[PDB]
Symmetry: C3
């Protein structure tokens, strides 16, 4: 009698962890696609920057022409890619245990 | 324990789906400014045939993927709804 | 088990919040470069009243939502925290 209640509970947690694993996978897809868009947008931005620096070359670039502290992009694609790989590993580990 | 944990997961998926929504909204919003900036530079170097020819560089284009992200959000909201119904 | 699952869920929440924090940092970093690029173009077309008037186009402005994202990140870190507290009891 105690066996059946513990196995019915074990089955619910096995099924619940399979759902969590599918939610994690969906979240990893979303972050991958968003990082791809950030990487894509950044290359356009940096080319726009080089373009503005060329047009103001005699003034020493756009930041000196604007008389401002220069803004630089901080690429962090590697760390986001690591966060995604960790989520993908956490999901496969849960899907493994539940089976 | 259970159903409480199931509701807590769905609450977490919801705040996740919302975070991704406002993140995609910012990408879309920034991209429009960048594309208008590009048209601005292509206009200023119209004689040379645009900014990429004036720079003597392979041109960069943004690959918009909002639809794929919006679909992931939809799927996340369907996943949270399932855990609440059961 | 209940406690081992909520401890796994909370670790996953921490990874998501970490991913969103890094993603928002990059958006904020990139946006400062694009708004300086816009100020650069408005300076170059100052006689025409800016790049939007020079292009004769509806002007695009960036809608900054970092605060709203940072609010959701804090909400996630509280959910991971509560799941860890409830895992013991
Ligand atoms: Cl730009």
């Amino acid at each position: 009698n105690l066996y059946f209640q513990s196995t019915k509970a074990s089955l619910t947690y096995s099924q619940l962890s399979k759902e969590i694993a599918n939610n994690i996978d969906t979240m990893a897809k979303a972050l991958t696609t968003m990082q791809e868009q950030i990487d894509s947008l950044a290359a356009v931005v940096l080319q726009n920057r080089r373009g503005l620096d060329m047009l103001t070359a005699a003034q020493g670039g756009i930041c000196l022409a604007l008389d401002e502290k220069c803004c630089f992009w901080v690429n962090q694609s590697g760390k986001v890619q690591d966060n995604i790989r960790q989520l993908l590993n956490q999901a496969s580990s849960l899907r493994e245990r539940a089976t």
